DNA sequence: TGCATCCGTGAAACAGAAAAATTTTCCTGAATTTTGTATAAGTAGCTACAAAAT
């Protein structure tokens, strides 16, 4: 096991780091430009409830 | 035509030559001090001198 788990690491680390690296491309500038906005519609949430188990108090 | 493969990604030659270069020489030339040298007064000195305070 602990081999596996071993190597592994040794390569998920990238795989992270790789991501953000895109995340943060993707996702760079949306930066707050504007309190004026507008718009009334959103967007509804409840609690995340995989099966009874409720997962986040709302 | 979805389905092959299949690009290519993110992770030792020489001798004889010559001609160059270069480079030491020169020289020289001039340019550039210094000094001589005047220079010219003015001088600031300086040296007596005089009356009047130790």
Same mark, same amino acid.
């Given at each position: 096991?602990?081999?596996?788990?071993?190597? $592994?690491?040794?390569? *998920?680390?990238? =795989?992270? &780091?790789?991501?953000?690296?895109?995340? %943060?491309?993707?996702?760079? $500038?949306?930066?707050? *430009?504007?309190? =004026?906005? &507008?718009?009334?519609?959103?967007?509804? %949430?409840?609690?995340?409830?995989?099966?009874?188990?409720?997962?986040?108090?709302?």
């Amino acid at each position: 096991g602990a081999r596996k788990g071993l190597v $592994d690491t040794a390569l *998920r680390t990238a =795989d992270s &780091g790789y991501l953000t690296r895109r995340l %943060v491309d993707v996702s760079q $500038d949306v930066i707050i *430009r504007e309190i =004026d906005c &507008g718009t009334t519609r959103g967007i509804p %949430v409840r609690p995340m409830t995989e099966g009874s188990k409720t997962l986040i108090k709302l």
